[PDB]
Amino acid sequence: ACVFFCEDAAIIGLAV
Amino acid sequence: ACVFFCEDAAIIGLAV
Amino acid sequence: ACVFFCEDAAIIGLAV
Amino acid sequence: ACVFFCEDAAIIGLAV
Amino acid sequence: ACVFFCEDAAIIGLAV
Amino acid sequence: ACVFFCEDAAIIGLAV
Ligand SMILES: [Cl-]
Ligand SMILES: [Cl-]
Ligand SMILES: [Cl-]
Ligand SMILES: [Cl-]
Ligand SMILES: [Cl-]
Ligand SMILES: [Cl-]
Ligand SMILES: [Cl-]
Ligand SMILES: [Cl-]
Ligand SMILES: [Cl-]
Ligand SMILES: [Cl-]
Ligand SMILES: [Cl-]
Ligand SMILES: [Cl-]
């Protein structure tokens, strides 16, 4: 698994 | 929800 | 389709 | 853009 | 790599 | 966080 990142601005990581 | 980005090169955002 | 990237640190692309 | 589903148990949709 | 499905209504697959 | 499913054929889950 690895961490994707999105913009909310804050950086949010999502583990997949 | 937040915006993930991919490479197409252009930057494309995808709202999730 | 486009390439999203995650952090594993290594950069990993994922085609979608 | 569409609704993906995941099992949380309950089934939840996710607008991608 | 596999086929995820979403409801668009029709069910559509997505090769991830 | 939940389990998404994809068709690989077998059905596989993916913890997102
Ligand atoms: Cl912030
Ligand atoms: Cl997470
Ligand atoms: Cl461009
Ligand atoms: Cl979008
Ligand atoms: Cl490395
Ligand atoms: Cl890939
Ligand atoms: Cl929709
Ligand atoms: Cl949602
Ligand atoms: Cl496949
Ligand atoms: Cl596709
Ligand atoms: Cl879970
Ligand atoms: Cl998994």
Side-chain angles (χ1 to χ4, degrees):
Chain A
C2 51
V3 181
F4 295 82
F5 299 93
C6 61
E7 169 172 11
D8 190 341
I11 306 163
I12 305 298
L14 166 69
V16 179
Chain B
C2 51
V3 181
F4 295 82
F5 299 93
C6 61
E7 169 172 11
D8 190 341
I11 306 163
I12 305 298
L14 166 69
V16 179
Chain C
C2 51
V3 181
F4 295 82
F5 299 93
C6 61
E7 169 172 11
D8 190 341
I11 306 163
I12 305 298
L14 166 69
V16 179
Chain D
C2 45
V3 182
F4 292 84
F5 298 94
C6 67
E7 179 165 278
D8 186 334
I11 309 301
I12 297 175
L14 174 61
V16 181
Chain E
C2 45
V3 182
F4 292 84
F5 298 94
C6 67
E7 179 165 278
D8 186 334
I11 309 301
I12 297 175
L14 174 61
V16 181
Chain F
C2 45
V3 182
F4 292 84
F5 298 94
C6 67
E7 179 165 278
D8 186 334
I11 309 301
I12 297 175
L14 174 61
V16 181

PDB file of all heavy atoms in Angstrom, chain C:
ATOM      1  N   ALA C   1      -7.437   8.133 -19.669  1.00  0.00           N
ATOM      2  CA  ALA C   1      -6.801   7.728 -18.403  1.00  0.00           C
ATOM      3  C   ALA C   1      -5.573   8.617 -18.067  1.00  0.00           C
ATOM      4  O   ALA C   1      -4.960   9.260 -18.920  1.00  0.00           O
ATOM      5  CB  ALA C   1      -6.398   6.238 -18.461  1.00  0.00           C
ATOM      6  N   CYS C   2      -5.231   8.652 -16.746  1.00  0.00           N
ATOM      7  CA  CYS C   2      -4.117   9.444 -16.286  1.00  0.00           C
ATOM      8  C   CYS C   2      -3.482   8.728 -15.127  1.00  0.00           C
ATOM      9  O   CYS C   2      -4.032   7.753 -14.604  1.00  0.00           O
ATOM     10  CB  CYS C   2      -4.574  10.838 -15.875  1.00  0.00           C
ATOM     11  SG  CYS C   2      -5.959  10.783 -14.737  1.00  0.00           S
ATOM     12  N   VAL C   3      -2.316   9.228 -14.745  1.00  0.00           N
ATOM     13  CA  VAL C   3      -1.483   8.586 -13.746  1.00  0.00           C
ATOM     14  C   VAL C   3      -1.590   9.361 -12.441  1.00  0.00           C
ATOM     15  O   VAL C   3      -1.241  10.541 -12.381  1.00  0.00           O
ATOM     16  CB  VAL C   3      -0.018   8.528 -14.193  1.00  0.00           C
ATOM     17  CG1 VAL C   3       0.823   7.843 -13.142  1.00  0.00           C
ATOM     18  CG2 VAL C   3       0.108   7.804 -15.528  1.00  0.00           C
ATOM     19  N   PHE C   4      -2.100   8.688 -11.418  1.00  0.00           N
ATOM     20  CA  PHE C   4      -2.051   9.183 -10.045  1.00  0.00           C
ATOM     21  C   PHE C   4      -0.785   8.661  -9.395  1.00  0.00           C
ATOM     22  O   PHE C   4      -0.270   7.616  -9.789  1.00  0.00           O
ATOM     23  CB  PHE C   4      -3.277   8.729  -9.253  1.00  0.00           C
ATOM     24  CG  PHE C   4      -4.562   9.308  -9.754  1.00  0.00           C
ATOM     25  CD1 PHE C   4      -5.206   8.750 -10.837  1.00  0.00           C
ATOM     26  CD2 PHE C   4      -5.125  10.417  -9.143  1.00  0.00           C
ATOM     27  CE1 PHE C   4      -6.384   9.281 -11.307  1.00  0.00           C
ATOM     28  CE2 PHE C   4      -6.309  10.954  -9.625  1.00  0.00           C
ATOM     29  CZ  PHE C   4      -6.932  10.380 -10.705  1.00  0.00           C
ATOM     30  N   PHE C   5      -0.302   9.376  -8.390  1.00  0.00           N
ATOM     31  CA  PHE C   5       0.945   9.029  -7.737  1.00  0.00           C
ATOM     32  C   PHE C   5       0.756   8.906  -6.244  1.00  0.00           C
ATOM     33  O   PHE C   5       0.035   9.704  -5.620  1.00  0.00           O
ATOM     34  CB  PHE C   5       2.016  10.074  -8.023  1.00  0.00           C
ATOM     35  CG  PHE C   5       2.343  10.211  -9.478  1.00  0.00           C
ATOM     36  CD1 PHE C   5       1.696  11.153 -10.254  1.00  0.00           C
ATOM     37  CD2 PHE C   5       3.289   9.391 -10.066  1.00  0.00           C
ATOM     38  CE1 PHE C   5       1.989  11.283 -11.607  1.00  0.00           C
ATOM     39  CE2 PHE C   5       3.587   9.507 -11.415  1.00  0.00           C
ATOM     40  CZ  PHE C   5       2.936  10.462 -12.186  1.00  0.00           C
ATOM     41  N   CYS C   6       1.411   7.902  -5.685  1.00  0.00           N
ATOM     42  CA  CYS C   6       1.411   7.705  -4.251  1.00  0.00           C
ATOM     43  C   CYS C   6       2.826   7.598  -3.723  1.00  0.00           C
ATOM     44  O   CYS C   6       3.782   7.387  -4.475  1.00  0.00           O
ATOM     45  CB  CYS C   6       0.608   6.458  -3.876  1.00  0.00           C
ATOM     46  SG  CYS C   6       1.206   4.920  -4.562  1.00  0.00           S
ATOM     47  N   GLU C   7       2.938   7.775  -2.415  1.00  0.00           N
ATOM     48  CA  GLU C   7       4.197   7.667  -1.712  1.00  0.00           C
ATOM     49  C   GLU C   7       4.278   6.313  -1.020  1.00  0.00           C
ATOM     50  O   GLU C   7       3.369   5.945  -0.263  1.00  0.00           O
ATOM     51  CB  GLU C   7       4.320   8.812  -0.709  1.00  0.00           C
ATOM     52  CG  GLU C   7       5.452   8.678   0.274  1.00  0.00           C
ATOM     53  CD  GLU C   7       5.636   9.925   1.118  1.00  0.00           C
ATOM     54  OE1 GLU C   7       4.760  10.813   1.078  1.00  0.00           O
ATOM     55  OE2 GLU C   7       6.662  10.025   1.814  1.00  0.00           O
ATOM     56  N   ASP C   8       5.361   5.578  -1.290  1.00  0.00           N
ATOM     57  CA  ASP C   8       5.636   4.297  -0.639  1.00  0.00           C
ATOM     58  C   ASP C   8       6.983   4.410   0.072  1.00  0.00           C
ATOM     59  O   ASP C   8       8.032   4.102  -0.499  1.00  0.00           O
ATOM     60  CB  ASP C   8       5.643   3.154  -1.659  1.00  0.00           C
ATOM     61  CG  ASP C   8       5.673   1.790  -1.001  1.00  0.00           C
ATOM     62  OD1 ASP C   8       6.049   1.724   0.178  1.00  0.00           O
ATOM     63  OD2 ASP C   8       5.330   0.788  -1.660  1.00  0.00           O
ATOM     64  N   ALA C   9      11.239   7.362   0.739  1.00  0.00           N
ATOM     65  CA  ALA C   9      10.108   6.647   0.139  1.00  0.00           C
ATOM     66  C   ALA C   9      10.118   6.845  -1.381  1.00  0.00           C
ATOM     67  O   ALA C   9      10.620   7.847  -1.903  1.00  0.00           O
ATOM     68  CB  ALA C   9       8.780   7.150   0.738  1.00  0.00           C
ATOM     69  N   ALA C  10       9.543   5.826  -2.103  1.00  0.00           N
ATOM     70  CA  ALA C  10       9.468   5.846  -3.557  1.00  0.00           C
ATOM     71  C   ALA C  10       8.188   6.511  -4.054  1.00  0.00           C
ATOM     72  O   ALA C  10       7.181   6.560  -3.343  1.00  0.00           O
ATOM     73  CB  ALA C  10       9.563   4.430  -4.100  1.00  0.00           C
ATOM     74  N   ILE C  11       8.244   7.029  -5.277  1.00  0.00           N
ATOM     75  CA  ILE C  11       7.060   7.516  -5.981  1.00  0.00           C
ATOM     76  C   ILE C  11       6.534   6.372  -6.812  1.00  0.00           C
ATOM     77  O   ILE C  11       7.290   5.780  -7.574  1.00  0.00           O
ATOM     78  CB  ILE C  11       7.360   8.705  -6.929  1.00  0.00           C
ATOM     79  CG1 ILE C  11       8.056   9.840  -6.193  1.00  0.00           C
ATOM     80  CG2 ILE C  11       6.070   9.232  -7.570  1.00  0.00           C
ATOM     81  CD1 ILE C  11       8.746  10.840  -7.114  1.00  0.00           C
ATOM     82  N   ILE C  12       5.248   6.060  -6.671  1.00  0.00           N
ATOM     83  CA  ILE C  12       4.631   4.998  -7.456  1.00  0.00           C
ATOM     84  C   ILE C  12       3.481   5.585  -8.280  1.00  0.00           C
ATOM     85  O   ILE C  12       2.667   6.306  -7.708  1.00  0.00           O
ATOM     86  CB  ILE C  12       4.092   3.865  -6.560  1.00  0.00           C
ATOM     87  CG1 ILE C  12       5.190   3.316  -5.646  1.00  0.00           C
ATOM     88  CG2 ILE C  12       3.502   2.754  -7.406  1.00  0.00           C
ATOM     89  CD1 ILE C  12       6.362   2.700  -6.378  1.00  0.00           C
ATOM     90  N   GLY C  13       3.427   5.328  -9.575  1.00  0.00           N
ATOM     91  CA  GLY C  13       2.365   5.810 -10.408  1.00  0.00           C
ATOM     92  C   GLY C  13       1.340   4.756 -10.561  1.00  0.00           C
ATOM     93  O   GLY C  13       1.673   3.591 -10.495  1.00  0.00           O
ATOM     94  N   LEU C  14       0.099   5.140 -10.726  1.00  0.00           N
ATOM     95  CA  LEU C  14      -1.017   4.203 -10.890  1.00  0.00           C
ATOM     96  C   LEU C  14      -1.926   4.726 -11.995  1.00  0.00           C
ATOM     97  O   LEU C  14      -2.460   5.817 -11.882  1.00  0.00           O
ATOM     98  CB  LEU C  14      -1.795   4.044  -9.584  1.00  0.00           C
ATOM     99  CG  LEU C  14      -3.174   3.364  -9.634  1.00  0.00           C
ATOM    100  CD1 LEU C  14      -3.037   1.899  -9.955  1.00  0.00           C
ATOM    101  CD2 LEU C  14      -3.928   3.538  -8.320  1.00  0.00           C
ATOM    102  N   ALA C  15      -2.104   3.932 -13.052  1.00  0.00           N
ATOM    103  CA  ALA C  15      -2.773   4.320 -14.121  1.00  0.00           C
ATOM    104  C   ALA C  15      -4.120   4.203 -14.005  1.00  0.00           C
ATOM    105  O   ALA C  15      -4.543   3.105 -13.681  1.00  0.00           O
ATOM    106  CB  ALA C  15      -2.033   4.011 -15.414  1.00  0.00           C
ATOM    107  N   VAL C  16      -4.928   5.234 -14.236  1.00  0.00           N
ATOM    108  CA  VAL C  16      -6.371   5.034 -14.109  1.00  0.00           C
ATOM    109  C   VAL C  16      -7.083   5.669 -15.285  1.00  0.00           C
ATOM    110  O   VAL C  16      -7.046   6.890 -15.459  1.00  0.00           O
ATOM    111  CB  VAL C  16      -6.941   5.631 -12.810  1.00  0.00           C
ATOM    112  CG1 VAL C  16      -8.459   5.425 -12.745  1.00  0.00           C
ATOM    113  CG2 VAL C  16      -6.266   5.018 -11.596  1.00  0.00           C
TER     114      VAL C  16
END
